[PDB]
Write a protein that binds this DNA or RNA. Structure first.
Ligand SMILES: [Mg+2]
Ligand SMILES: [Mg+2]
Ligand SMILES: [Mg+2]
Ligand SMILES: [Mg+2]
Ligand SMILES: [Mg+2]
Ligand SMILES: [Mg+2]
Ligand SMILES: [Mg+2]
Ligand SMILES: [Mg+2]
Ligand SMILES: [Mg+2]
Ligand SMILES: [Mg+2]
Ligand SMILES: [Mg+2]
Ligand SMILES: [Mg+2]
Ligand SMILES: [Mg+2]
Ligand SMILES: [Mg+2]
Ligand SMILES: [Mg+2]
Ligand SMILES: [Mg+2]
Ligand SMILES: [Mg+2]
Ligand SMILES: [Mg+2]
Ligand SMILES: [Mg+2]
Ligand SMILES: [Mg+2]
Ligand SMILES: [Mg+2]
Ligand SMILES: [Mg+2]
Ligand SMILES: [Mg+2]
Lengths: 89, 96, 57, 53, 168, 107
RNA sequence: GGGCACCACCAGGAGUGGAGCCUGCGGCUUAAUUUGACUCAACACGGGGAAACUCACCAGGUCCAGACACAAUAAGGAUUGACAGAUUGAGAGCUCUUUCUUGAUUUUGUGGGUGGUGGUGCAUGGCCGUUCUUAGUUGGUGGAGUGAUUUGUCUGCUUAAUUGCGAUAACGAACGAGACCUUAACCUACUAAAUAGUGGUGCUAGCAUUUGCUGGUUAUCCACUUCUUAGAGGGACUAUCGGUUUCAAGCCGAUGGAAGUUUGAGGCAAUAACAGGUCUGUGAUGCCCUUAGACGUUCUGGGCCGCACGCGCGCUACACUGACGGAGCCAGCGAGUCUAACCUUGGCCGAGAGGUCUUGGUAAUCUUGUGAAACUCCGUCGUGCUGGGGAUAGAGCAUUGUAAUUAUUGCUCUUCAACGAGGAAUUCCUAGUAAGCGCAAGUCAUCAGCUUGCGUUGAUUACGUCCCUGCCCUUUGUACACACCG
């Protein structure tokens, strides 16, 4: 029972004449439909990351007073040290 | 890292007497520029030097800039039995 | 897989000093390492001059 | 050693690579640049190529 | 060298780009701000603008002979054909690359984002600038990323005056 | 050597027209105060090296293209000039960003 | 309710949807047919034109390129290879027999690294797309409100524009628009040029004549810059004059002008966002997975091209406003090799594709006046699926390549298919524009039916409106705020 490339010419069901008799499956005219972006505003992860996770990771809104009142002085110290190391001493 | 002692000494001698190495990241280049070993051998030996200290490494557009350090300039004298504390190699040797 | 070695002293070349006597034999090849190599069926195969090789065992 | 880079890559996509990142696809080799089109947009002001029109 | 002037000027631009990124990677702690390559006859001069020029020049020829040797070996120049000077940048708080590289090690040393960002925004602003803006984008122990801005003063965003006066 | 005119040509190439014209005016000023005979600064057509890359790193988006471009401005000056004092003034006075090349022509 | 826009319509143009191929997507098939992307904002997109490589996929085969540290170990011993002979792809010592060989470089465990086009782009950076090429955003002081807020930032008119006039509890400002920059258009005004051109002629020289058409030399000529080039400038500001508007911003016409559509075209382009795309651009990257019978890397061969079919971008067509042939004969943007064989003129050979001997060119120098195609003229055809169309298929000759079979592509002869202008629907477009036409560049060893640009020929139709679609603003309602996918 020889098969292979020589068995390809012997093998039935392969060929345009007998593929054209069989009907097209109906999935060929369908669509993938948007990779589940129909409710992308609705978060589907199931985390819904809480108030603490954003008020302690990037901080809350009320801690800006502690940040910039100390960020006033470090740049002034940088100016003082830059005048110290520029050409003085 | 099977690499002969004769080949290893020609990376270490060049690194001592000339200070730095540049090697393109192209393994099987079969010849490093101005080291007469394989480019894979150069990269492979200087990474082995880097891991125990002794060499700093930057990459920067596929070229592996290898620079000898202060612990490495002592290591290249001690284990390799090159003349002791008389040869800086090479940053202040001739040019200053 | 790669290589298994055997405990050895004498490589097919008996003894250079056997109670004051050289007891060497076994017609060699042109290797300066001479050294005595594989023979399957009337066919030696060289070890340093295995690239070009004229007369065998 | 035996067959490690035994295939000829004297030509084609795999002969050349970006000098920044070694990427065979999307490369520009106009004027001997050999930078990919994604790194050329980053470095294009350092090369000297400016958006004018 | 027998190449066309198109390819020669393009390749000199590529050499500038490669040298600039190499010094950006190498001289990060040393306050790098830019490089200028002067191609004189018989030698080329590579001038490094960096705030810590004493850290660039190292300890008595260390760290500047290293960079000269590294550049001449990668670009295959003859020894002595390339010399590599370092002159410090004046008015540090107007170099955007120096301010960004300063913020980078400020945040890598573990300093707060608003503190570092306002500490360079007002440093630029009283270094004598018309305006400054720091945008920080990313995440911090959080599964969601946000970008926050820190602006002070007068800025522009469109036109050739951006190529003129804005340093990014 | 004894003030024999040798017919050099200076080729001036740059991507920066301001500094290139600074060099060109310097050479013409030197050759006019030295009373040299010259064919002056001839300005070649500017080579506009255009690269139309794709603006996106992806495929996604409206298909937007960027025309990055580099201009090469090129000039040449012919100088029938003595050999020593003119090779001195072309050895000195080199601007960065402008590449010079000096070729002696006896054709 | 009012605005705006040929990603809307009107009036039209050119179409597409129908055919055949090309290409991309889905599905099916497969060992694999790698994968991301799905209304605009996926579908000639990932610069994605994949023979190998790329390559991520499949059947197999190597290699370690497993740092470093510790303990064993290798001094008990760790790499290499000549056969031939196989289950071999195989001249792969990959094993296995046989043996020798350079011998603390390794090897084997534990830790820990390193690699990954492996995952998560719903952890991120960066970049890009979109809202939006729209005109929007914000605070100082004052007014209103206990307050969140609101006015300013607006009824009208105008503009391309939160552009301005004007109304006015607001006044005066900033970003965005605009100004800016690049390009195109004018400059017989300036500085010039054997890498551009012209005129005489130092000198020539030819054919026809009574000077027309040319050829050739720049310490083996002179002069000039009109044309060409590129520096610095000039120029336009809707100028002038009418009309009209509240004599306001403006708009319309005419004259002049190189230019009166923001002069044409772009580049840059705010605040706020999107769970938009990308971890498969990177030595951008957290974490996870894998890490030597690997998901690293390499090699061999295949696949990405597989086809009952559905859809999108295109090419070629249905011809006489044309095909064929001969002749005429004209661009512009480019690019190009000694850091090695790139652009190739000329001669010769060849029907052709191509070959071969040389040459110029690292380029305003030479390819190149890219002697391009459409087009024009004269002929053959003659309304016939024809001499339209050129699919499919056969045989042959070449080129590139290590390799062309699943035809790489080119050429010659032959085969000569649907297609007779395309239902429902749908795209783009307002003047050097639509459209026809080729050329250059990109990727490229070879391959353009693609794209980015360039020029050649060059219309019809409106200078408008909210009717459809989308967007913006105001008013209104709200039990929405994860915001109607509520
Ligand atoms: Mg503005
Ligand atoms: Mg603007
Ligand atoms: Mg219509
Ligand atoms: Mg058509
Ligand atoms: Mg069709
Ligand atoms: Mg497929
Ligand atoms: Mg995905
Ligand atoms: Mg892989
Ligand atoms: Mg990676
Ligand atoms: Mg108020
Ligand atoms: Mg308001
Ligand atoms: Mg208003
Ligand atoms: Mg009011
Ligand atoms: Mg002129
Ligand atoms: Mg998503
Ligand atoms: Mg890709
Ligand atoms: Mg393969
Ligand atoms: Mg494909
Ligand atoms: Mg014809
Ligand atoms: Mg022309
Ligand atoms: Mg192909
Ligand atoms: Mg092409
Ligand atoms: Mg394509």
């Amino acid at each position: 029972r020889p098969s292979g490339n020589e068995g390809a010419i012997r093998d039935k069901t392969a060929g345009r004449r007998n593929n054209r008799s069989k009907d097209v499956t109906d999935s060929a005219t369908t669509k993938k439909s948007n990779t589940r972006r129909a409710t992308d505003r609705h978060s589907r992860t199931g985390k819904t990351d809480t108030k603490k996770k954003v008020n302690q990771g990037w901080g809350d809104d009320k801690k800006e007073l502690s940040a910039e009142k100390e960020a006033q002085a470090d740049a002034a110290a940088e100016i003082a040290e830059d005048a110290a190391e520029a050409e003085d001493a | 890292m099977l690499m002969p002692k004769e080949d290893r000494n020609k990376i270490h001698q060049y690194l001592f007497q000339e200070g730095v190495v540049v090697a393109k990241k192209d393994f099987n280049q079969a010849k490093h520029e101005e080291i007469d070993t394989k480019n894979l051998y150069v990269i492979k030996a200087l990474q082995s030097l880097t891991s125990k200290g002794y060499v700093k490494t930057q990459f920067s557009w596929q070229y592996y800039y290898y620079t000898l350090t202060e612990e490495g300039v002592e290591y290249l004298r001690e284990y390799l039995n090159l003349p002791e504390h008389i040869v800086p190699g090479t940053y202040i040797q001739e040019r200053n | 897989h790669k290589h298994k070695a055997v405990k050895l002293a004498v490589l097919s070349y008996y003894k250079v000093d056997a109670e004051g006597k050289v007891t060497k034999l076994r017609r060699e090849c042109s290797n300066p390492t001479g050294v005595f190599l594989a023979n399957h069926k009337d066919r030696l195969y060289c070890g340093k001059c295995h690239s070009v090789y004229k007369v065998n065992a | 050693e035996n067959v490690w880079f035994s295939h000829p890559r004297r030509y084609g996509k795999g002969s050349r690579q970006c000098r920044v990142c070694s990427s065979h696809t999307g490369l520009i080799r106009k004027y001997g640049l050999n930078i990919c089109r994604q790194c050329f947009r980053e470095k294009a002001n350092d090369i000297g190529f400016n958006k004018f029109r | 060298a027998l190449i066309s002037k198109k390819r020669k000027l393009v390749a000199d631009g590529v050499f500038y780009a490669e040298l600039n990124e190499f010094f950006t990677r190498e001289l990060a702690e040393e306050g790098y701000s830019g490089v200028e390559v002067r191609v004189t006859p018989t030698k080329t001069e590579v001038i490094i603008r960096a705030t810590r020029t004493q850290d660039v020049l190292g300890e008595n020829g260390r760290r500047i002979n290293e960079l000269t040797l590294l550049v001449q070996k990668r670009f295959k120049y003859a020894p002595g054909t390339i010399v590599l000077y370092a002159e410090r940048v004046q008015d540090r708080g107007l170099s955007a690359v120096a301010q960004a590289e300063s913020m980078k090690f400020k945040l890598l040393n573990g300093l707060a984002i608003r503190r570092a960002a306002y500490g360079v925004v007002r440093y630029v602003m009283e270094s004598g600038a018309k305006g400054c803006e720091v945008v920080v984008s990313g995440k911090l122990r959080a599964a969601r990323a946000k970008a926050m801005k820190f602006a002070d003063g007068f800025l522009i965003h469109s036109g050739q005056p951006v190529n003129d006066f804005i340093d990014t | 050597q004894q003030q024999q005119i040798i017919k050099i040509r200076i080729t001036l190439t740059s991507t920066k027209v301001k500094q290139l014209e600074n060099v060109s005016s310097n050479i013409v000023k030197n050759a006019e105060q030295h009373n040299l005979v010259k064919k002056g600064p001839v300005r070649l057509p500017t080579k506009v090296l255009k690269i139309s890359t794709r603006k996106t790193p992806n495929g996604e988006g409206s298909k937007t293209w960027e025309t990055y471009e580099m201009r090469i401005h090129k000039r040449y000056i012919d100088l029938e000039a003595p050999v020593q004092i003119v090779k001195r003034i072309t050895q000195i006075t080199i601007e960065p960003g402008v590449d010079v090349e000096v070729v002696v022509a006896s054709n």
